[PDB]
Design an enzyme around this catalytic site. Structure first.
Site, PDB file in Angstrom:
ATOM      1  N   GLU A   1      -0.860   2.724  -7.812  1.00  0.00           N
ATOM      2  CA  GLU A   1      -0.964   4.006  -8.505  1.00  0.00           C
ATOM      3  C   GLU A   1       0.318   4.798  -8.332  1.00  0.00           C
ATOM      4  O   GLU A   1       0.796   5.432  -9.273  1.00  0.00           O
ATOM      5  CB  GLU A   1      -2.126   4.818  -7.965  1.00  0.00           C
ATOM      6  CG  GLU A   1      -3.447   4.094  -7.979  1.00  0.00           C
ATOM      7  CD  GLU A   1      -4.578   5.007  -7.570  1.00  0.00           C
ATOM      8  OE1 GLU A   1      -4.782   6.016  -8.270  1.00  0.00           O
ATOM      9  OE2 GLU A   1      -5.257   4.738  -6.553  1.00  0.00           O
TER      10      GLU A   1
ATOM     11  N   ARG B   1     -15.368   1.173  -6.171  1.00  0.00           N
ATOM     12  CA  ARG B   1     -16.821   1.344  -6.122  1.00  0.00           C
ATOM     13  C   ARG B   1     -17.612   0.609  -5.050  1.00  0.00           C
ATOM     14  O   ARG B   1     -18.822   0.794  -4.961  1.00  0.00           O
ATOM     15  CB  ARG B   1     -17.450   1.035  -7.483  1.00  0.00           C
ATOM     16  CG  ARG B   1     -17.279   2.143  -8.512  1.00  0.00           C
ATOM     17  CD  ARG B   1     -17.934   1.746  -9.802  1.00  0.00           C
ATOM     18  NE  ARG B   1     -17.087   0.861 -10.586  1.00  0.00           N
ATOM     19  CZ  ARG B   1     -17.506   0.155 -11.631  1.00  0.00           C
ATOM     20  NH1 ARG B   1     -18.773   0.219 -12.015  1.00  0.00           N
ATOM     21  NH2 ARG B   1     -16.651  -0.596 -12.310  1.00  0.00           N
TER      22      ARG B   1
ATOM     23  N   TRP C   1      -9.362   7.341  -1.760  1.00  0.00           N
ATOM     24  CA  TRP C   1      -8.028   7.125  -1.219  1.00  0.00           C
ATOM     25  C   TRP C   1      -7.226   6.283  -2.196  1.00  0.00           C
ATOM     26  O   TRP C   1      -7.780   5.591  -3.046  1.00  0.00           O
ATOM     27  CB  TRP C   1      -8.071   6.482   0.172  1.00  0.00           C
ATOM     28  CG  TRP C   1      -8.883   5.234   0.283  1.00  0.00           C
ATOM     29  CD1 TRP C   1      -8.550   3.980  -0.167  1.00  0.00           C
ATOM     30  CD2 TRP C   1     -10.162   5.109   0.910  1.00  0.00           C
ATOM     31  NE1 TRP C   1      -9.546   3.085   0.152  1.00  0.00           N
ATOM     32  CE2 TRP C   1     -10.548   3.751   0.811  1.00  0.00           C
ATOM     33  CE3 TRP C   1     -11.022   6.013   1.543  1.00  0.00           C
ATOM     34  CZ2 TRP C   1     -11.761   3.276   1.323  1.00  0.00           C
ATOM     35  CZ3 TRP C   1     -12.233   5.540   2.052  1.00  0.00           C
ATOM     36  CH2 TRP C   1     -12.588   4.181   1.938  1.00  0.00           C
TER      37      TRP C   1
HETATM   38  C1  HEM Z   1     -12.706   5.292  -1.894  1.00  0.00           C
HETATM   39  C2  HEM Z   1     -11.733   4.624  -2.618  1.00  0.00           C
HETATM   40  C3  HEM Z   1     -11.402   4.713  -3.970  1.00  0.00           C
HETATM   41  C4  HEM Z   1     -10.449   3.927  -4.524  1.00  0.00           C
HETATM   42  C5  HEM Z   1      -9.534   2.978  -3.752  1.00  0.00           C
HETATM   43  C6  HEM Z   1     -10.507   4.161  -5.950  1.00  0.00           C
HETATM   44  C7  HEM Z   1      -9.608   3.661  -6.871  1.00  0.00           C
HETATM   45  C8  HEM Z   1      -9.502   4.065  -8.214  1.00  0.00           C
HETATM   46  C9  HEM Z   1      -8.353   3.768  -9.068  1.00  0.00           C
HETATM   47  C10 HEM Z   1      -7.257   2.762  -8.794  1.00  0.00           C
HETATM   48  C11 HEM Z   1      -8.528   4.457 -10.207  1.00  0.00           C
HETATM   49  C12 HEM Z   1      -7.512   4.425 -11.313  1.00  0.00           C
HETATM   50  C13 HEM Z   1      -6.867   5.763 -11.616  1.00  0.00           C
HETATM   51  C14 HEM Z   1      -5.750   5.661 -12.639  1.00  0.00           C
HETATM   52  O1  HEM Z   1      -5.300   4.526 -12.914  1.00  0.00           O
HETATM   53  O2  HEM Z   1      -5.328   6.718 -13.155  1.00  0.00           O
HETATM   54  C15 HEM Z   1      -9.820   5.126 -10.129  1.00  0.00           C
HETATM   55  C16 HEM Z   1     -10.454   5.797 -11.165  1.00  0.00           C
HETATM   56  C17 HEM Z   1     -11.704   6.442 -11.071  1.00  0.00           C
HETATM   57  N1  HEM Z   1     -12.470   6.509  -9.901  1.00  0.00           N
HETATM   58 FE1  HEM Z   1     -12.153   5.608  -8.177  1.00  0.00          FE
HETATM   59  N2  HEM Z   1     -11.490   5.089  -6.291  1.00  0.00           N
HETATM   60  C18 HEM Z   1     -11.998   5.503  -5.073  1.00  0.00           C
HETATM   61  C19 HEM Z   1     -12.924   6.533  -4.975  1.00  0.00           C
HETATM   62  C20 HEM Z   1     -13.563   7.203  -5.989  1.00  0.00           C
HETATM   63  C21 HEM Z   1     -14.534   8.258  -5.772  1.00  0.00           C
HETATM   64  C22 HEM Z   1     -14.910   8.822  -4.394  1.00  0.00           C
HETATM   65  C23 HEM Z   1     -15.056   8.599  -6.999  1.00  0.00           C
HETATM   66  C24 HEM Z   1     -16.035   9.549  -7.342  1.00  0.00           C
HETATM   67  C25 HEM Z   1     -17.016  10.112  -6.549  1.00  0.00           C
HETATM   68  C26 HEM Z   1     -14.337   7.747  -7.946  1.00  0.00           C
HETATM   69  C27 HEM Z   1     -14.460   7.853  -9.331  1.00  0.00           C
HETATM   70  C28 HEM Z   1     -13.588   7.306 -10.269  1.00  0.00           C
HETATM   71  C29 HEM Z   1     -13.540   7.694 -11.688  1.00  0.00           C
HETATM   72  C30 HEM Z   1     -14.480   8.572 -12.488  1.00  0.00           C
HETATM   73  C31 HEM Z   1     -12.388   7.175 -12.167  1.00  0.00           C
HETATM   74  C32 HEM Z   1     -11.856   7.419 -13.562  1.00  0.00           C
HETATM   75  C33 HEM Z   1     -10.689   8.396 -13.534  1.00  0.00           C
HETATM   76  C34 HEM Z   1     -10.015   8.507 -14.881  1.00  0.00           C
HETATM   77  O3  HEM Z   1     -10.585   7.986 -15.859  1.00  0.00           O
HETATM   78  O4  HEM Z   1      -8.922   9.111 -14.967  1.00  0.00           O
HETATM   79  N3  HEM Z   1     -13.411   6.920  -7.320  1.00  0.00           N
HETATM   80  N4  HEM Z   1     -10.409   4.913  -8.872  1.00  0.00           N
HETATM   81  C1  LIG Z   2     -10.401  10.923  -7.434  1.00  0.00           C
HETATM   82  C2  LIG Z   2     -10.974   9.676  -6.751  1.00  0.00           C
HETATM   83  C3  LIG Z   2     -10.234   8.376  -7.139  1.00  0.00           C
HETATM   84  N1  LIG Z   2      -8.848   8.479  -6.774  1.00  0.00           N
HETATM   85  C4  LIG Z   2      -7.976   7.442  -6.848  1.00  0.00           C
HETATM   86  N2  LIG Z   2      -8.162   6.366  -6.174  1.00  0.00           N
HETATM   87  N3  LIG Z   2      -6.883   7.566  -7.605  1.00  0.00           N
HETATM   88  C5  LIG Z   2      -6.911   7.915  -9.013  1.00  0.00           C
HETATM   89  C6  LIG Z   2      -6.237   9.281  -9.243  1.00  0.00           C
HETATM   90  C7  LIG Z   2      -4.760   9.382  -8.766  1.00  0.00           C
HETATM   91  C8  LIG Z   2      -3.674   8.975  -9.788  1.00  0.00           C
HETATM   92  N4  LIG Z   2      -3.854   7.597 -10.189  1.00  0.00           N
HETATM   93  C9  LIG Z   2      -2.280   9.142  -9.203  1.00  0.00           C
HETATM   94  O1  LIG Z   2      -1.715   8.128  -8.527  1.00  0.00           O
HETATM   95  O2  LIG Z   2      -1.557  10.280  -9.386  1.00  0.00           O
END
Ligand code: HEM
Ligand SMILES: CCCNC(=[NH2+])NCCC[C@H](N)C(=O)O
Ligand code: HEM
Ligand SMILES: C[C@H](O)[C@H](O)[C@H]1CNc2nc(N)[nH]c(=O)c2N1
Ligand SMILES: C[C@H](O)[C@H](O)[C@H]1CNc2nc(N)[nH]c(=O)c2N1
Ligand SMILES: CCCNC(=[NH2+])NCCC[C@H](N)C(=O)O
Ligand SMILES: [Zn+2]
Lengths: 419, 419
Positions: free
Chosen positions: A295, A121, A290
């Site tokens: 992950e 975030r 990204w």
């Molecule tokens: C730009 C770099 C970003 C990184 C490094 C990042 C990283 C992460 C990681 C590590 C997770 C955990 C997913 C899992 O453990 O399954 C996550 C979840 C999440 N991210 Fe981010 N994120 C990024 C961008 C975004 C963007 C662009 C959005 C939305 C516009 C976002 C929205 C969320 C939401 C809603 C979750 C919850 C997903 C779920 O509950 O399965 N993220 N993010």
């Molecule tokens: C969709 C925006 C956030 N994306 C992100 N940093 N990763 C979470 C989704 C990918 C999933 N944890 C995987 O390794 O299969």
């Protein structure tokens, strides 16, 4: 008033007032705690049968418009009041309303900013918004997604982006991606009880097959797009291979690592979440950021319910694989994480390690408390699946609550669809 | 009814009904979640000024007696009813009541069994109870503790035990150990801003000095016992060195590890918690189990707020200590964990690795759901500070609630004491 929050690593104290703006009830009860539940109803926003009541819609719409114009340095009361009046008229005359592009942009970034389970975030303001609210067909959906995947991938230099399809109306004409992620590998339950590919996509994969998709039965077979437009049944679309960038796994020391035949897609894009803003719900808005090393390295490759490659790597490292107390698992998983990071950097695909991610989030959480006295955070998701206490977030107490705008989960489309 | 709970590693589903028996309100609100708070008031049981109201006491006492006799295979209604009558008479005549030894034993094991933050609970039935409810002086307290430390240590073959001092009456004559743990190292803030020893005992250490204790200014100086009997001011007692068993740290590969001059006590004993049972509160009941490697290896040695030895070990390993993305921290912390385990085994001091601990807890949690349809568990404490997803508990959803009997926290004695 504020809830006093402390960081045990620095002894630093924070005051959370933002939790006041929370909406409905969360997951936890009055005498119990369900914080470790993955899919609580408090984080889900299911189906609709009729439009959303005007009595409910209007209040939320006013609030959002107020939030929007409120986020401005140098106010614009005039425009503000004008917008309030215009939205009202629209709800009265149409039974809903349309967001200006700028409000959609603002809303997508706030909903991200308000995602408690997201560690990236600090990037919340850098987001590309593709407005596809005009989309009408699946073919058009498919075209919008391809454009998204292409823009986001950017030849490895990943860019964060989201594509917003038409909002929900009566909930009987929903735009939905039956996929959990834009790009994901299929899972097949072989005839011998075995499981080839990603065990997590077993059900969906079977669905795709039922929808006529041809199973290649490989460990890394990218699944098709299953798009549902305007409430219409889902149509299956193959993603152009040229669009799916992948990284082959290799270790900077163990040359036998390549012999494992491992690789993963470079683009992590959540496909099945719902965006909520000012009374409106967008059941279709794929977005992406990204990857964070763990992950793939820890969860996708080592989860017992995923590829589960941890004992194999252990054997090839010549570790006491039968002596749990030898800490061989700690050793292997760490080398796998190094393979994953090294392989992405080598191939020039944007990736981030968990230590760096944790550190930047702390910087963000501080900006947030300083900026708006709070930051909704789910400790259980924000702490890496490895190196827990080694990261700063582990020592940080936090409050988890649902604000608005917000990205909700939804019920599996194939469970609630009238064919 | 039951709250459906799932294990994502096995897909196994459980039904928690036990959460129904929860008492007061927990930490989390109706629209917020404070699960990552270390010391919530919901887990604390503070001072008293007057006895506890008969209207409150009696109901709880009846409930506990009912729980006790209920835990029997082959009931004893007669004795049961007789006991209910006897306790009532006692409360009526005395204004409180005394537990039989067997009920105290039962109560200490249940309170352990009901500790959500404990991962060693599969051992809950194997507990030595030393009844010191007769104690009258600090000197006597000091003698009881020494006997406890000696029995528990058992020359390295650690045994779980608890010493129960007099229950609280009017709360104006409290028996209390001003220590957080029976055995712990002092922390000194050197004149140069530096900090020598354990930074976590800085305040307490200063208290001991104020109480006349002589500071040796070393990195591993065992602190004195500060005992408060019958509401009397605290008296400082030095623990007989012969009683404090310690393990010198050494790595089975890196011979330079010894050159770090590291060691830790073999006995982990919580000294400042309060036992609650049938209306009664015991503000003094030190108890102990045995160590889990990560407590020392990861937390005590590597916490930035503790000994913080992670970069030093990294340098001596010749790691890219200035490249966070190199994962050197993952590498070092793992070798430190191997040093800690190896050193304990070598010196024949009972210890347990986090993988083995996590695995046994899962076995326990299953016995519990099968035995009494539930198991209060705090996911945030139960998941190791390293190897998170590599352990099975990480993939297990759980409910955290406060049952009774229970081990509560208390307010720092020096904050609420009339000298
Ligand atoms: C730009 C770099 C970003 C990184 C490094 C990042 C990283 C992460 C990681 C590590 C997770 C955990 C997913 C899992 O453990 O399954 C996550 C979840 C999440 N991210 Fe981010 N994120 C990024 C961008 C975004 C963007 C662009 C959005 C939305 C516009 C976002 C929205 C969320 C939401 C809603 C979750 C919850 C997903 C779920 O509950 O399965 N993220 N993010
Ligand atoms: C969709 C925006 C956030 N994306 C992100 N940093 N990763 C979470 C989704 C990918 C999933 N944890 C995987 O390794 O299969
Ligand atoms: C026999 C083996 C035992 C093992 C391996 C074990 C392990 C643990 C661990 C790892 C912690 C975490 C401490 C921290 O992170 O600071 C803990 C906490 C706790 N354990 Fe156990 N335990 C054992 C025995 C006991 C016994 C005998 C009792 C009580 C009769 C007990 C009661 C608790 C309680 C109340 C906590 C919470 C302490 C706090 O909140 O600071 N444990 N245990
Ligand atoms: C049961 C538990 O909630 C579940 O395993 C959670 C824990 N923390 C997590 N954290 C992240 N980032 N992603 C996950 O999938 C999970 N799984
Ligand atoms: C802020 C957070 O609650 C805190 O750092 C917790 C996390 N989990 C823990 N788990 C255990 N076993 N022990 C601890 O001290 C902590 N600290
Ligand atoms: C007191 C019984 C439970 N003990 C135990 N397993 N350890 C927890 C307390 C010790 C503390 N974590 C330390 O390493 O300094
Ligand atoms: Zn909660």
């Amino acid at each position: 008033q504020y809830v006093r929050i402390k960081n045990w690593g620095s002894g630093e104290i924070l005051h959370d007032t933002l939790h006041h703006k929370a909406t409905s009830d969360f997951t936890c009860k009055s005498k119990s705690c369900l914080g470790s539940i993955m899919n609580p109803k408090s984080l889900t926003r299911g189906p609709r049968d009729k439009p959303t009541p005007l009595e409910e819609l209007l209040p939320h719409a006013i609030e959002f418009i107020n939030q929007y114009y409120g986020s401005f340095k140098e106010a614009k009361i005039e425009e503000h009041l004008a917008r309030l009046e215009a939205v009202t008229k629209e709800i009265e005359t149409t039974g809903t309303y349309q967001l200006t592009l700028d409000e959609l942009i603002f809303a997508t970034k706030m909903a991200w900013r308000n995602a408690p389970r997201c560690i990236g975030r600090i990037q919340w303001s850098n987001l590309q918004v593709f407005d596809a609210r005009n989309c009408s067909t699946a073919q058009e959906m498919f075209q919008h997604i391809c454009r998204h995947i292409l823009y986001a991938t950017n030849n490895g230099n990943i860019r964060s982006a989201i594509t917003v399809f038409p909002q929900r109306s009566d909930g009987k004409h929903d735009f939905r991606l039956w996929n959990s992620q834009l790009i994901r590998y299929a899972g097949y339950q072989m005839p011998d009880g075995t499981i080839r590919g990603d065990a997590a996509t077993l059900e969906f994969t079977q669905l795709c097959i039922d929808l006529g998709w041809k199973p290649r039965y490989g460990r890394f077979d990218v699944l098709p797009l299953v798009l549902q437009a305007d409430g219409q049944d889902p149509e299956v679309f193959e993603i152009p291979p040229d669009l799916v960038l992948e990284v082959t796994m290799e270790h900077p020391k163990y040359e036998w690592f390549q012999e494992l035949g491992l690789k993963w897609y470079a683009l992590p894009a959540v496909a099945n979440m719902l965006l909520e803003v000012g009374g409106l719900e967008f059941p279709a808005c794929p977005f992406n950021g990204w990857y964070m090393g763990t992950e793939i390295g820890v969860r996708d490759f080592c989860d017992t319910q995923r590829y589960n490659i941890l004992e194999e790597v252990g054997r090839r490292m010549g570790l006491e694989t039968h002596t749990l107390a030898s800490l061989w698992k700690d050793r292997a998983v760490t080398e796998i994480n190094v393979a994953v990071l090294h392989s992405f950097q080598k191939q020039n695909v944007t990736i981030m390690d968990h230590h760096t991610a944790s550190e930047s989030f702390m910087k963000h959480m501080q900006n947030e408390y300083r900026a708006r006295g709070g930051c909704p955070a789910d400790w259980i998701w924000l702490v890496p699946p490895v190196s827990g206490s080694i990261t700063p977030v582990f020592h940080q107490e936090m409050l988890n609550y649902v604000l608005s705008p917000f990205y909700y989960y939804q019920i599996e489309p194939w469970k609630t669809h009238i064919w």
